[PDB]
Write a protein that binds this ligand. Structure first.
Ligand SMILES: OC[C@H]1O[C@@H](O[C@H]2[C@H](O)[C@@H](O)[C@H](O[C@H]3[C@H](O)[C@@H](O)[C@H](O[C@H]4[C@H](O)[C@@H](O)[C@H](O[C@H]5[C@H](O)[C@@H](O)[C@H](O)O[C@@H]5CO)O[C@@H]4CO)O[C@@H]3CO)O[C@@H]2CO)[C@H](O)[C@@H](O)[C@@H]1O
Length: 582
């Protein structure tokens, strides 16, 4: 049905059935955030700069008051101008519903206000001034169509709205839904997209994602040429081009093949009996076979995470790690947690957990350490294998854990609602505000929700610590890096004490491409965009960079900093402007 040469087929981004195209619903479908609803500015991790997208510029009124100027051209796909009211609406709705884009904004932002039709004003909250969050929530603000949502709300509960009618869909991005069924989701380019003159059009007319059940089936499709843009775990991926002579590639031609995405955690639900004990969580950390599982299950595609949660793959981040503390605590050369069952057993012994007749430990208050599950989505074979290795080792120390692999949608439900025991899941990655971003996402009770209520905003494990809140509130009250560092250092002490959840490995930014129909994919040799994975929040520029093999097009002129000839604003410039405005 779809013209092959005008379609990008995608793998590894959509797992389980389509759900909704509504960012205020408990679940939405891959492609909704990525391609349908764009931000004011798009952060460019690769260049540490910001693309003015829906916004054309900003101006600091003072260091705590930021105006964002919406492009005159920015217009919803139904013809209605994108206006400041749309920005206010999106954030106020998220606050009202307790779910939706920009969760947590009202903690660090005093107000968002429409000061003119095309001018939004954001004011930082002074009591707990945080310059990083001020910038994140403002520059990265996503508008949502007020005139559409107020309509839906008169008809039904917004949380129940599916938004699955292609003709009726109102979007700010260059794609909208075209067709879906239990086996596929397809998006079609919006040819009269508001951004067509400033950004050009993305090259593919259709984005199609067949819903594969597992990694092997998606891999089989990729090998035969039926997937152009892949975000999959693939065993021995180099064999695809080395041995099988396929026209496929990755970011790196050599080991490790993938750039890093962020931090993969073993999340441990703090609300569960047994798992609520810091001692038990610490024992679990020592029982994970880091090296062996990353070699065998993960094919060396990523390495062990530092327990500080800081991504030490990047030199500039190391200054934020208290290495002496980590080394002292864990007894290793760099402060990484060793795989040490003797230690895991000792920790449990000293916390008064004694093995019963069935070999499962029982605490002093009579709490048995099990039964528990460790769970990841069905078909995610690398994580599944990890889970088996972890579960076996936990069983050996007297924590009764068995693996369970439900459909993605069910897994996500249990994760977001905090009804899981153990899971492997993602967190956040490198960014201008790292590692504040990861402490905020993983440790901040303010982003969590009660057990039974969905949160995608953070703290799935329902960790609850008020000192961490205080530290986050003061960490960026000034831009002095020492203030930041000292807060991070104390947070690290708290992490090692409480083991709220376990940073385990640096997740791979899964990204493979076929050059059969589509060329000029980003890579080490063509590093045009540093977040090209099809599931990544920030993937969209990839679609403007590639072109048809039979109709090659030039590099987008807007990529690059202003000084280089593009339109991107370096982060340093934004901070300069902020400081100027004091
Ligand atoms: O290796 C195992 C397995 O991987 C399958 O590829 C996985 C990959 O491993 C995961 O890392 C990748 O995780 C990304 C998710 O796909 C994506 O949905 C999640 O998008 C974030 C987004 O970054 C964030 O901005 C969005 O914040 C909003 C919150 O949702 C709201 O709660 C809050 O209120 O408002 C903000 C908006 O301001 O949240 C979403 C959801 O977390 O980003 C993840 C990390 O990049 O997922 C891939 C699967 O799709 C691979 O396919 C298998 O082959 C392999 O076995």
């Amino acid at each position: 049905s779809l013209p092959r040469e005008d379609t990008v087929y995608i793998g590894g981004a959509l797992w389980g059935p389509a759900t909704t195209w509504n960012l205020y619903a408990p679940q939405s479908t891959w492609g909704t955030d990525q391609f349908m609803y764009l931000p004011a500015f798009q952060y460019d991790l690769g260049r540490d700069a910001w693309i003015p997208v829906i916004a054309e510029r900003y101006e600091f009124v003072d260091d705590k008051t930021l105006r964002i100027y919406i492009r005159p051209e920015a217009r919803w796909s139904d013809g209605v101008p994108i206006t400041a009211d749309d920005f206010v609406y999106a954030l106020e709705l998220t606050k009202e519903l307790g779910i939706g884009p920009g969760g947590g904004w009202d903690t660090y932002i005093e107000y968002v206000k429409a000061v003119d039709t095309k001018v939004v004003e954001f004011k930082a909250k002074e009591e707990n001034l945080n310059y990083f969050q001020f910038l994140s929530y403002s520059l990265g603000a996503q508008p949502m169509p007020k005139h559409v949502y107020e309509r839906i709300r008169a008809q039904m509960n917004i949380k129940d709205w599916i938004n699955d009618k292609p003709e009726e869909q109102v979007v700010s991005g260059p794609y909208k839904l075209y067709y879906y069924d239990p086996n596929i989701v397809v998006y079609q380019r919006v040819d009269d997209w508001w951004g067509k003159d400033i950004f050009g059009l993305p090259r593919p007319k259709y984005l199609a994602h067949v819903i594969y059940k597992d990694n092997p089936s998606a891999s089989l499709a990729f090998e035969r040429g039926d997937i152009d843009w892949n975000g999959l775990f693939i065993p021995s991926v180099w064999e695809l081009w080395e041995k099988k002579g396929l026209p496929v590639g990755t970011w790196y031609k050599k080991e490790p093949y993938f750039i890093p995405d962020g931090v993969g955690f073993v999340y441990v639900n703090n609300t569960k009996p047994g798992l609520s004990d810091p001692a038990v969580r610490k024992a679990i950390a020592y029982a994970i076979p880091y090296n062996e599982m990353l070699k065998k299950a993960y094919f060396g595609y990523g390495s062990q995470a530092h327990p500080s949660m800081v991504i030490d793959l990047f030199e500039p981040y190391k200054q934020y790690i208290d290495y002496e503390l980590a080394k002292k605590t864990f007894g290793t050369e760099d402060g990484r947690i060793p795989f040490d069952l003797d230690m895991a057993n000792k920790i449990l012994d000293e916390a008064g957990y004694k093995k019963g007749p069935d070999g499962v430990r029982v605490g002093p208050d009579g709490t048995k350490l099990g039964p528990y599950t460790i769970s990841v989505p069905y078909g995610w074979t690398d994580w599944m294998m990890m889970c088996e290795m972890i579960a076996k080792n936990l069983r050996s120390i007297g924590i009764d854990v068995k693996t369970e692999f439900p459909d993605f949608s069910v897994w996500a439900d249990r994760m977001t609602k905090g009804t899981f025991d153990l899971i492997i899941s993602w967190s956040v990655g490198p960014s201008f505000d790292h590692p504040f971003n990861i402490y905020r996402f993983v440790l901040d009770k303010r982003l969590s929700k009660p057990v039974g209520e969905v949160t995608w905003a953070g703290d799935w494990e329902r960790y609850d610590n008020d000192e961490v809140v205080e530290l986050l509130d003061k960490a960026v009250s000034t831009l002095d890096p020492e203030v930041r560092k000292q807060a991070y250092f104390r947070i690290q002490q708290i992490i090692y004490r409480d083991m709220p959840s376990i940073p385990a490995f640096y997740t791979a930014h899964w990204y493979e491409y076929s050059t059969k129909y589509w060329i000029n994919w980003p890579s080490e040799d063509n590093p045009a965009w540093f977040r090209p994975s099809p599931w990544h929040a920030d993937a969209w520029p990839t679609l403007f960079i590639i072109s048809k093999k039979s109709d090659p097009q030039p590099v987008p002129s807007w990529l690059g900093t202003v000084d280089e000839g593009g339109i991107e604003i370096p982060t340093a410039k934004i901070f300069e402007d902020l400081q100027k405005a004091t």
